[PDB]
Symmetry: none
């Protein structure tokens, strides 16, 4: 009866065990502290949680585990237990035994309740969820990080408050003077008989010490008074420093890493340092600024995405997006299926902004271009509406293109090198003659369209 | 009456809200704390402050808003409010209700004043301005950020001290002992009856707690002495723990990206490693470091960062810069604009320190130069200064055009900003414009008779 | 007898110095502090410790040293010592002199013991090991650094507490009041006669001061009460101020460069921005995110970082990886090694999730694939599984060679690591080896009868 | 009598004024604190410093200033004063008047001595030197940064100690109880009559407060007791936070920026993550590792340096380094002056490590290569000692080179694209025929040397 880890019912169960793991993270320290055994009522609540994890450790041999390296989903029930018995099985079993009851049976000895600290490991269940919720891309990174540190602190000071109160209670009532709380004289309130004041006061005071110690404030109203309380202040203060450096380090890691907007900062302020050097006249300055800025972000992110991912998906997504207009674009009309599908998968997007000047006179256009969307204005001569193409003039005639390319609005341009263009023809020479024969048809307007026919036969010599 | 956000009157109006939000973001904590109701005097200020934001929410339906995703300005008088009614609406409206008045009439209940804590949001107006001041770079970035960090703190330690002094006043007069301020014994000054001490030194003492706790100093004169001051102190300390990391995260974000001595040190790090590897001459080191000093002293450390702008607009920049210098040169006297324009596109920018030898007598020269600013001396080897190159002069023309080695060792006497043109750049333009090339030869003959 | 540093005996010998430097870097502060001379028992340990380093400086002339600049190992028995005599020499030699013995004989002068503070250098041995442990990465970097930042700060407070307790003992017994430890009133425990209290709780109390000052907590139970403890406390606090920044500078250096969830979030940041911009289909999002989940769950996020290694050695890597899989494929039965070797060079690595459709029936295929690990099912459309592709199988051969569309829709039932070969890559090798191409056609005919 | 700023005598004078500025930085606060006027002896020391700066402000109108933007060294005496009278003249003059003497003349009023705080600006003189010493590349960056923060903190706490003691003394002796030092009870030492204890104790105590406050330790033994001492603790604690963030920020800025060695970290540990993914067999692994690593650092730093700097210097340094062997290298022998000087200035260095495999069979060598140093072993065939060249076979014959290039040791290779090679010939066609005529001579060994002659005439058709 193996069950998939992604099964909704088992996913709900893990969330159910999370709440029963969030309870025992913030209630096990209370059992190590103020409570020397569950009086009457917490028994049913503790045993319910224990059998909840006892059935959970039972319901782990049928849970389909999957190795990260192999990335193989394993249905083998017997092979599931190989990882569990070595990873967390030993720790988990010691966290399910009703150690409080066996504490009550072994003469109420205090040695056994020290081993109850293994139940503190259950907090790792909710930390794993924070890792998973970090893995989930839905929510903001700042929100989960701040919440994670708010939690990895709330828990640390809470477990350092229920233990510090224990270190005061490990001495008898007679020697309560040599404790951090028995000698407390906060204002006119004297914590004389701490063992019998209201439980809420002796905990909030304990949490006060942990929080004013974690943040390295240290008022000194509450402080270690004994060697055992000093030794714990040794570990806790040193540990908080490492966590404090980690929290500080993580916070500035997020700020430094969050440089997409700091890339904006870079561009703008480097132009700004150049201009603190020169106070350049701002008209052309800001115009070219806008242009470069937007074109850059566009092309850069385009490369980034089109670069990763297996080729088949890039082939398919390009077909979904580039193929429609390429099928019946003026420069590429009457082609075949494999011919259009070959070019698209290796088309490079080079978007150009409204008003951007792409090329000018005397430029050898070695990269074929196609207008996916928007109107183009070749004010060198030609107006290219959406679903148009250009740039062939310098590919086959080899004379540099005398067409100053100017964008009217939102000219989406696909770049295809002239080396890539001639590579397409040779692979499918049959369709290469068809597109050239279609190219020899009515589109004979001017030097880039009429003289096109004379240099179209140049590839005819190549393919014949 | 839709009003554009760029309107000078409306923009100055938001400053009027800003100056009154600054007053109301540092008076709301005081009203929640030291004051159990404003008695007589600043009541006029309270009413005017409550209507200042009330007349703002009224006119928020007159403003024109822009959608960032579409980047299109919207003047619609019906689609404006959908963003407003689902972003703040209630928090702005409830911040205008005179909570002082309703408290003073509804049995002076203490719980009513707690709703006045939502007026602390009005600091969001002055943090939006800092965001706007961040967007328009203008001022130095190390200045605005430090001012921003010295504000989220100055506002916190001002609202965490007025709130903390409120906690002490929650207890009755007879229970002054169980308070953070009633049990102070600072030196010979005892805060026995704190409520009868002047509010001035009460706020300073209360703020003394806030800043020695904020900066994690924590002297220990003032600490929580209750269960309410205890719980709040943990909350305020925890809040500063994540806010304090933010402040030093931003400060180190500026130093990391700061264009300062950090980056030039790397420039000499690899080059000095190479000349020892390349075992070049000692005189070579003096020149390159001199140029590097010529390039690091003035921090002339941008050229490929400026070339980030495409050539399809860097020409526009070159024609804005280098075209006016080229036109008045006697060599190009009468040259066509397109011929001159193409020359400017291919020009380059370099500096030369005075005392250096740009070219040697009898040497082959493959570069063209034009004087923009500064004086050069054409010295012919004794060494005699054959000619003086004032700004707007051309030198090196003989070697490129006439394939004749330079007979004058021109030396820099004062630093000059000199443009540069290459040989094959010059030939290509010459072939296109044969008429311009012939006129240049005539100009050179007439200019050096 | 020159000994190579890589010798197992000598390397284990330096650990013997390391374990005895660890003992002597946490006992020198104790000897400078609590002990005014080691009375009887650990005298044997003191003498052995002083000769342990003395036999080390003796044998430092037997070791073989390497010069990093030349990267050439030197066995010379005369040029070895020039580095030694000008780097440490004196500090190592003076660390071996039995300062305990000379103190006990020269009128038990207090000033003599101050020269024993130079034995604190012996912690440099155990910080060099951490540097060496840093060089050989091996263990997780977040582990070694934290252990390092738990050593410069477990040596500094241990030596700033034993030194601080020494300052209290400088004053006479009658002047216990003007001390940091003589005037303690921790609870009902009064440190009246601190010298008569057990050294155990004296060190713990003294270390209690060191760590609440190190971590900038500063409770205020223990503070400087003198002019000597006052001056030292400012020195120790200032030293931690620049050392504390170093510790959090290193910790944030690891998180910045940590290859963790920080970087994948950017990968979905731009792509998710594009499909909405490209208005692609919803089914497209499920696939790409699935592959991205296939690539982020396993953190298979390196391919261009692996392509950083030149192709002139990435082939060597490919032949180490992909050559053994290619050889036993029935299609290449009897193919020459060079023909097989060239195929491996052009191979590529991809993953496919089970349940996906790699190719569709009747579709044009331009890619070649070979099974390395995992099982694939050749399903022909009802849907019938025509064939089962065990590891070491070839599929898609028909479409590329015979220009015939695939008649089977092969679907992934279990995740497979499949190599990839392109068409024009296949044609180019085929033309070079015509004999191999003919045999492949014979193998394909014989393999699919 | 204008003097150059780089003149050694004036450079010594600035260092002399630095010491007299380092004295008045650490002694002006003492004049604001314990000293209510110079008793007898410090008069001659103070006035000597004042006339030292009085002659210094005099000797600034003849000091040749140079604007950063223009980078022009100005010899004009009258134009020197334009910057000084606007930059620091007003501040400086108020720092030269003997304010202590005028304090003694105006009824010993304490208002005038407040304005003595302007003398604290003299610390900017030594901060400028730290900027200059940072500008100097001789010394380590970590050393100067740590020293700079050590100073800018020694000074900050020193000036916050001499002011805090002032805030205690601004109250009369009768009300000394309401001060931070009059109420001090450190241990059994009572600071009862602070105004008459030894000056060294009341200063070290004052410096104790500043340092335990700056580092955010805050023991609380010494603390503010009055409103004026609280208000200064407001400014000082807040100011130290900004400086503390700056010191922390600078320290981690140095660590993050110091990534040349962290680039090593990157390469090695990315290979390490790939291998934690696969435990790849290490033989070939580490061999290819070494190769890639060293070749990468070499080529990368080479590009970096050869990339900046005006062209003339790169032309000259390449002549000093590349020209010697290029003059008489086997593939380039019997050439002319301009021909060899043209190629060198646009030669790109591509160093290859001992044992590195550069190219293989079937590779179209479109980049000419020359062995500057080291022995090459073309185990495809040819052994190339230092001062040798190869790679021409695929440039003119166009057949891909069947020469597997293998390095014996330290093969320094200069890269020259075949497009650059043919560009060289056309510019100096006269010398292009001479090198080809020399190429047609005895070097006719094999297909890349003997068949060379047949394809040498291909350029003869181009140039004729
Ligand atoms: C989740 C919170 C679980 C709280 C369980 C409290 C158990 C109980 O009955 O309280 C008595 C216990 C034990 O005292 P006692 O009753 O044995 O004496 O004491 C408390 O009241 C502890 C309250 C702490 C609650 C903190 C929860 C928020 C996180 C900080
Ligand atoms: C820089 C060194 C400056 C030393 C100043 C001379 C000392 C002096 O004037 O003492 C009188 C005054 C007191 O005068 P008075 O107490 O005689 O009145 O002493 C001080 O206030 C300073 C004494 C300590 C000097 C600390 C400088 C160390 C630098 C760090």
């Amino acid at each position: 009866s193996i069950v998939h880890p992604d099964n909704r019912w088992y996913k709900a169960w893990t969330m159910f065990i999370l709440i029963w793991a969030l309870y025992s993270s913030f209630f096990t320290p209370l059992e190590f502290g103020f409570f020397r055994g569950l009086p009457e009522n917490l028994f049913i609540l503790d045993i319910a949680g224990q059998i909840a994890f006892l059935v959970d450790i039972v319901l782990t041999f049928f849970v389909a585990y999957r190795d990260s390296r192999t990335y193989r989903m394993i249905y083998k029930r017997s092979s599931i237990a190989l990882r569990y018995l070595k990873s967390t099985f030993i720790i988990d079993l010691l966290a399910c035994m009703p150690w409080d009851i066996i504490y009550k049976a072994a003469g109420e000895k205090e040695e056994v309740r020290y081993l109850l600290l293994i139940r503190l490991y259950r907090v790792h269940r909710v930390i794993l969820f924070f890792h998973k919720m970090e893995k989930d891309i839905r929510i903001n990174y700042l929100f989960t990080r701040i919440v994670k540190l708010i939690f990895v602190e709330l828990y640390c000071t809470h477990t350092a408050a229920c233990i510090f109160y224990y270190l005061a209670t490990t001495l008898p009532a007679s020697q309560e003077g040599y404790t951090w709380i028995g000698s407390l004289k906060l204002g006119d309130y004297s914590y004389s008989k701490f063992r019998e004041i209201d439980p809420w006061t002796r905990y909030t005071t304990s949490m006060y010490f942990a929080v004013v110690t974690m943040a390295t404030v240290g008022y000194g109203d509450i402080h270690a008074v004994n060697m055992r309380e000093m030794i714990f202040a040794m570990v806790y203060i040193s540990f908080n420093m490492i966590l404090g450096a980690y929290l500080i380090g993580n916070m500035t890691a997020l700020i430094v890493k969050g440089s997409k907007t700091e890339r904006f900062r870079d561009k703008m302020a480097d132009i700004m340092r150049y201009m603190n050097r020169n106070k350049l006249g701002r008209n052309i300055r800001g115009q070219i600024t806008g242009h470069l800025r937007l074109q850059y972000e566009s092309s850069y992110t385009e490369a980034a995405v089109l670069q990763d991912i297996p080729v088949s998906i890039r082939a398919k997504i390009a077909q979904t997006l580039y193929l429609p207009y390429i099928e019946k674009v003026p420069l590429f009309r009457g082609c075949s299926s494999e011919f259009i599908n070959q070019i698209v998968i290796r088309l490079h997007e080079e978007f150009f902004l409204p008003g951007e000047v792409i090329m000018e006179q005397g430029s050898v256009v070695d990269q074929l271009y196609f207008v996916c969307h928007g109107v183009l204005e070749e004010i060198g001569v030609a107006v290219l509406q959406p679903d148009h193409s250009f740039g062939e003039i310098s590919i086959l005639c080899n004379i540099p293109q005398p067409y100053t390319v100017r964008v009217a609005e939102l000219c989406r341009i696909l770049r295809l090198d002239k080396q890539s263009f001639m590579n397409i023809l040779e692979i499918f020479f049959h369709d290469g003659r068809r597109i050239l024969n279609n190219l020899l048809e009515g589109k004979e307007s001017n030097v880039r369209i009429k003289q096109l026919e004379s240099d179209i036969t140049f590839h005819i010599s190549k393919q014949e």
